[model samples]
Target: MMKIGVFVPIGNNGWLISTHAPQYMPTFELNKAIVQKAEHYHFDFALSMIKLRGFGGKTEFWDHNLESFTLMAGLAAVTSRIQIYATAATLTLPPAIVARMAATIDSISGGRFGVNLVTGWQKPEYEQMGIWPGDDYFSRRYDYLTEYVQVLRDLWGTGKSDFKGDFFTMNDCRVSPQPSVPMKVICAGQSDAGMAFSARYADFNFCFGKGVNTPTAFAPTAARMKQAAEQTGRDVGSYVLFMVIADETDDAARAKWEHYKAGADEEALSWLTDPTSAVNINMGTLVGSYASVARMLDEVASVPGAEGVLLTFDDFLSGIETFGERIQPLMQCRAHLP
Candidate 1:
């Protein structure tokens, strides 16, 4: 069957200020409800986005964003059936520390920890934190991810090892309590370099749900990535990404999506549109009705070597509940096709 994953919005204050924030929900309470609801609905995974601060606003999720790893650790303890994936930015954290955190979380969840490695793309975010590496962002990002993934693999695969690289170095380091199941490393990249990196490392690559607007283009991108994997003699077909969205009805969903777009902060939108952003906004965010969203996902999943979808709701509880009630069964019926 086609697996479904949900993205949990963990920042309360930040969520309050964002255009798509959950409806008056407390962080901890929302977390609990969302996790329980996702599991009850048979969702395969729950992902918590890591946000340190809001670039455009003075909200809590921005000013007081919860740490992704800590939240994932907690969620792992409470939720049984859902895999927990947390976002980690290579620019903001050391690879060794991230590796240790991943291992720790994996153990906590009984081998259910997964990671979404995001190379920092927001310039203002880095500037506000006084950590922007200026001219060599992408180059440095590649180096950082390379070293980061290497350290994670080494620590999990062996007891002691030394790593030497341009951005990171470790000697005789041991990461204890290896995960019983292989930990998943997911990467989101839309650029040439980003695609290569995903092909090289990520267990699954995260993409925008925009393929709903252009179905033919969806598999084309997947095909290109698969070709890149084959040229390197790697099995690209082993991992895939799902992009999803849900609404009470097709009209309601599209209207809500439009509302989000209309209310989006101009500055934040600009940041997304910036040339150096390293993302194609249209390809990432899927905005449509449940049937429309399902049809688009079905088209993408129909591609050879497709895995499943990660459904991100504008309003987590409402959106996901609708998806579980409406979209999930439709996907399950068609999942057997290549």
Candidate 2:
């Protein structure tokens, strides 16, 4: 069976930047409720992205955001079965501190914790904190991440690191109280450099799925990851991100999706990208009645090298319940789950 995970809402309005989408802050209570429900339905994992800054718009876009590791640590204590992952802004945090934090959460979640490493592309998120290296750093960000992950691995593996690299210099760095289980690493790198990074170090690679209702459009991305991993003799797999806008009927769902598109937050879209994509931020979507959505998800599972799918919802509170009852039970890929 294909693994299934939720990209938990960690920012204002979640993934949708539209004014018509559900407008709510990313609160622990809200995420806890969502994760608990996902766990109840036998989800494999839940991940949160790290965003330090937000695009200023009428909806404030992601202006209000929560720190990822801290939030996941809180969630770790409350949930039992499901795995939890937190994104780390490698540019903002040192690898040693992140290693220790991962260990801490590993203890909290009883060894069910993992990390998503991101070399932030948004300049303002770091510039406001005076940590943005320079414009030239863009070309070399993955190189920087390469050194960062090595430092993390060294500290976790032997409790000490003396590695030296162009970006990081570890002089006998140490992290105590190691995790009981080896922590899994994830990288959401779509570029060539990014894929190489995941192949060499990460357990899974996250990529954006293309187009609406095209469940298998991301197969090429997964194939790239698999090819990269095969060269390295590694077993890295790909997880595509998606959004679900499901209803009782395909027409009703399309109508709601059209309504959200009509209310696109232009100011936020300007900071982000395309208006059509800005509505759900270009995530591969499944818009239809519950059974239709199930059939599409099963198709996603059929893609070679597809380890899993990360999902978001137009309205999490209702969308999650509907998926649990009306969607999952019908998915052939998920029939093995309770």
Candidate 3:
């Protein structure tokens, strides 16, 4: 069966650019309700991203955020069956610490936990913490990440690491009570270097889905990942991130889309759209009626070796609910689920 999952809204406003979008704070309770709902629908997995800083503007994009591992730990206790993943900001924490944390959460969820390691691109997120390695980091971060994952694999899979790399030096380090099942490693790697690193070491490579309501936009990303993995002789599949806006009818969904664009928060949106910004915020946007949205997602599944799609929403509670009740029932990829 084709797998589906959610990019849990660990931040305010979920994923939208409009001042017209619903505004709220990120809280454990807020995330709790959403994950519970996602599990109720039998989503294949749920993922929470790490965002330490927010874009400064009226909406305060992503400012108040929860720590990824801790949040997933809490969700693990409350959820069963559905896999949970937390991002590891490689610059912020050591690999050994992350491995132990993943083991703890895996134990809590009966081995339904994984990690997404990111070679963070945002400068201020690390700048305020005094860990920003300097501007040269952008070009070299993937190589740094390659070493980071090496240590993580050594600890989690073998319970010991004697890794010595240009970025990390771990001498016979040990992680006790290693994960019950092997911890799955993933990375959202869009750049060529990023994709190759993932192909060499990660089980999944996440790429940004392109275009607004333009189905099949993410096909090339899957192709790139497959071609990269072919060189490494490892089987790494591609998953994509998307925003879903759906309604009962095409016209109704278009109206909501129009309204959100009309109320676009230009101040916050500019930084997101700016090519020079620290964060890459433009994602494949899916807007249509319920059937249309479902059809689009099925098309995403049709992309070359498309493993899955991780979704975000404007109003998350209702978004997943309708997706489960109204959309998934119509989706060919999810037909086997029900």
TM-score top scorer: 2
TM-score of each: 0.82, 0.97, 0.95
Which portions of model 2 miss their true places by more than 4 Å?
A: 274-276
Query: How does candidate 2 score on lDDT?
Result: 0.90
lDDT of 1 by residue, 188-297 (tens): 77666777887888776665443335543556566666776665666654233333445656677656555554554555444434011111134344546677767776
Stretches of candidate 1 off by over 4 Å are 12-26, 57-64, 211-216, 237-249, 259-289, 332-338
Candidate 1, residue 199: the lDDT equals: 82
User: Residue by residue across 1-338, what tens digits does model 2's lDDT show?
Assistant: 78889999999999887878889999999999999998888889999998898887899988989999999999999999999999999988889999999999999999999999999998989999999999988899988998999999998899999999898888888898888999899999999899999999999999887778888988998998889998899999889888999999999998988888988899888888512366777778888999999999999999988978898999988988999989999988887875
Write out the backbone clash pairs for model 1.
Answer: 13-60, 13-61, 14-61, 54-62, 208-283, 208-284, 209-284, 242-309, 242-310, 250-289
Write down the TM-score for model 1.
0.82
Worst ten-residue run, lDDT, model 3?
272-281
Clashing pairs in 3: none
Rank by TM-score, highest first.
2, 3, 1
Report lDDT (Cα) of residue 152, candidate 3: 89
